[PDB]
Enzyme design. Structure first.
Site, short mmCIF file in Angstrom:
data_model
loop_
_atom_site.label_atom_id
_atom_site.label_comp_id
_atom_site.label_asym_id
_atom_site.label_seq_id
_atom_site.Cartn_x
_atom_site.Cartn_y
_atom_site.Cartn_z
N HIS A 22 0.76 -1.16 0.06
CA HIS A 22 -0.06 0.15 0.07
C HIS A 22 0.77 1.15 0.11
O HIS A 22 0.35 2.51 -0.03
CB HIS A 22 -1.13 -0.01 1.28
CG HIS A 22 -0.48 0.22 2.45
ND1 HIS A 22 -0.69 -0.95 3.62
CD2 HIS A 22 0.26 1.11 3.00
CE1 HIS A 22 -0.17 -0.25 4.56
NE2 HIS A 22 0.56 0.82 4.36
N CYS B 284 4.00 1.60 9.57
CA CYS B 284 3.88 0.24 8.61
C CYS B 284 5.25 0.01 8.06
O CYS B 284 6.05 0.43 7.89
CB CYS B 284 3.01 0.77 7.26
SG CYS B 284 1.34 1.08 7.98
N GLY C 121 3.02 6.00 10.22
CA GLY C 121 4.27 5.77 9.88
C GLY C 121 4.95 4.67 10.41
O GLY C 121 6.07 4.29 9.85
C1 ZQB Z 1 1.05 2.55 8.25
N1 ZQB Z 1 2.02 3.50 8.17
C2 ZQB Z 1 -0.27 3.26 8.85
C3 ZQB Z 1 0.20 2.70 10.44
C4 ZQB Z 1 -1.54 2.88 11.22
C5 ZQB Z 1 -2.05 4.18 11.42
C6 ZQB Z 1 -3.12 4.56 12.22
C7 ZQB Z 1 -2.51 4.29 13.70
N2 ZQB Z 1 -1.51 3.03 13.64
C8 ZQB Z 1 -1.40 2.21 12.67
O1 ZQB Z 1 -0.74 1.22 12.79
N3 ZQB Z 1 -1.58 2.76 8.43
C9 ZQB Z 1 -2.10 2.68 7.20
O2 ZQB Z 1 -1.59 3.53 6.30
C10 ZQB Z 1 -3.19 1.75 6.90
C11 ZQB Z 1 -3.29 1.69 5.15
C12 ZQB Z 1 -4.40 0.80 4.82
C13 ZQB Z 1 -4.78 0.00 3.64
C14 ZQB Z 1 -5.04 0.92 3.52
N4 ZQB Z 1 -4.48 2.33 7.43
C15 ZQB Z 1 -4.84 2.43 8.75
O3 ZQB Z 1 -4.38 1.55 9.31
C16 ZQB Z 1 -5.81 3.28 9.16
C17 ZQB Z 1 -6.44 4.62 8.70
C18 ZQB Z 1 -7.43 4.65 9.66
C19 ZQB Z 1 -8.32 6.16 9.65
C20 ZQB Z 1 -9.45 6.04 10.49
C21 ZQB Z 1 -9.30 4.96 11.56
C22 ZQB Z 1 -8.60 3.96 11.65
CL1 ZQB Z 1 -8.78 2.70 12.43
C23 ZQB Z 1 -7.40 3.78 10.38
N5 ZQB Z 1 -6.82 2.95 10.15
#
Ligand code: ZQB
Ligand code: ZQB
Ligand code: NA
Ligand code: NA
Lengths: 305, 305
Positions: free
Chosen positions: A41, A145, A143
């Protein structure tokens, strides 16, 4: 003596961590030999977080859209490919700090260490269990991920987890072949974690650790059977206990002289009356994130090199 | 989100750990530049564990009675000296993996990571606090002496603890200048740890972490004063709260919009009625081994390199 939530030493993993940028997205990658592994992603934008088609997104990239930095050095991307939900970035330089490693998929109930990273830089290490519902209760900010989970077997690092997303307070990711733990996908849908349960064999291992460390107040003279025990566990959302579990607890039974079914009788009682304001190894709840092997490791003292 | 007991990444320390043998005693040492630091009781035998005279024991040694091994390589000891309760072994080779470091003495209430080692080999990392009675609640087996505690400040490792002994279930050691934390000596006497108390400023920091992570059930609309609060803390064996502590909690108050004295009113209530079967960040007890800085670090995300 004493008993702590103890993580594996992380030096061997710290040297594999890199930063990967594509567009305006920066996250972490794992650099082993001449391949960088990271969540696919990273090729998403805002428009494609809800319904991405990763094959399309990837074909529209070339090697130079991937900025990979190992501390100061930049790594030249010379090829890319997708494997399930990870991206494999071939780079021009093999990581000289590549440890002996393997990729393993773990089962619910097993524990591992997480090296939480931001911008390719290690920030903290902690231990967690893969839950029965295939999530982990981690600690991760935006960040993180691409941070990895791992165990150490002597000199060999077994990578078992790469972090991809947060779902309502808990965390979901893939093995290093890119296959998700659990029924999750790397897009924005209505997905939620299923019901969690308590990992019974781990609770029993922890009660043995308590006995080894001098906490004995919950023991009693009774015994029970697997079936009468499991009858009570189900009411409390505890995973059922198998003969395989009894056998795995063997070393701990041997060392304390308390039979597994003996210890199950104490657990039964704790489930039905609670702790009454008493604590076990400094906790007022029954802890289920230590495996039998964790206890032995910590209460007998094996090392790694 | 999420909240874990998180330790510093240990790679930088793992490369400094060595094995030190003298006679039939083997323990760990810390190799920085061309000096190996280890507990002086490595020169003891059985006869001198009760009433040793270390100056006498040391004069009867020569450099070749000290076997120092860095993994496979042996290090030649070319000089030795004693500084308080540590031994400084001068060796012929400066450690090429010497990080930027300093020696700092910590205060009760502060936290650090421990890299537990056996035979010079890292086994596990965990976080603990220096207790108000100058012990730590560690996890250590025979042979762990010389394991070190440390914090990381950006690129700089601050060593603050070297493990020397276990005293009735808890652990005591020195700073890296060899001075004991607490009123302990490295011999067999009738010494015991004094009464411990709960580190109040850390409990408040943890309650803020809870709020940041969505646990709000314990909040209430009341406020209190430092003096009325401290009046209740003393009854419960909580350290008194100073204006300095209020100021240190500032960033967390700012981020949550809950004034410190506001949060003290919730703590007061929790002390007087308990949790009633509810949990905070997954614990049924009030946790005091996270400092305000730990919370900020984990709930905002600073890294190190
Ligand atoms: C990776 N860098 C990032 C880490 C996340 C961000 C939220 C707090 N902790 C984490 O572990 N995650 C990320 O970009 C993913 C990508 C997905 C595949 C499309 N998204 C989320 O984890 C994400 C975004 C949001 C927005 C609102 C609420 C929640 Cl629970 C979310 N999770
Ligand atoms: C160092 N290698 C060793 C580690 C100890 C051993 C006990 C479990 N955990 C530990 O942290 N400690 C050691 O050699 C010291 C040396 C002192 C200065 C003379 N001794 C102890 O910590 C020790 C020995 C005993 C015997 C019985 C009961 C207790 Cl609490 C003991 N502590
Ligand atoms: Na019993
Ligand atoms: Na209040």
């Amino acid at each position: 003596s004493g008993f702590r939530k103890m993580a594996f030493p992380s030096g061997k993993v710290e040297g594999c961590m890199v930063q990967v940028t594509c567009g305006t997205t920066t996250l972490n990658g794992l650099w082993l030999d001449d391949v960088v592994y990271c969540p696919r992603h990273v090729i998403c934008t805002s428009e494609y977080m809800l319904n991405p088609n990763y094959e399309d997104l990837l074909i529209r990239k070339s090697n130079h859209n991937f900025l990979v930095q190992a501390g100061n050095v930049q790594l030249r991307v010379i090829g890319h490919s997708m494997q399930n939900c990870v991206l494999k970035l071939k780079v021009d330089t093999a990581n000289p700090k590549t440890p002996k490693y393997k990729f393993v998929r773990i089962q619910p109930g097993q524990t591992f260490s997480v090296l939480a990273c931001y911008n390719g830089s290690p920030s903290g290490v902690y231990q967690c269990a893969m839950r029965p519902n295939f999530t982990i209760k981690g600690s991760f900010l935006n960040g993180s991920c691409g941070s990895v989970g791992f165990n150490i077997d002597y000199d060999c690092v077994s990578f078992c987890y790469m972090h991809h997303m947060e779902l309502t307070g808990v965390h979901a990711g893939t093995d290093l072949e890119g296959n998700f733990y659990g029924p999750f996908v790397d897009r924005q849908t209505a997905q939620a974690a299923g019901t969690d349960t308590t990992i019974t064999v781990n609770v029993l291992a922890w009660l043995y650790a308590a006995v080894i460390n001098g906490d004995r107040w919950f023991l009693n003279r009774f015994t029970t059977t697997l079936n009468d025990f499991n009858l009570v566990a189900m009411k409390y959302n505890y995973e059922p206990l198998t003969q395989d579990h009894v056998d795995i607890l063997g070393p701990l039974s041997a060392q304390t002289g308390i039979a597994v079914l003996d210890m199950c009788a104490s657990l039964k009682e704790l489930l039905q009356n609670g702790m009454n304001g008493r604590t076990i190894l400094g906790s007022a709840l029954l802890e289920d994130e230590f495996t039998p092997f964790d206890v032995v490791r910590q209460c007998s003292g094996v090392t790694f090199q």
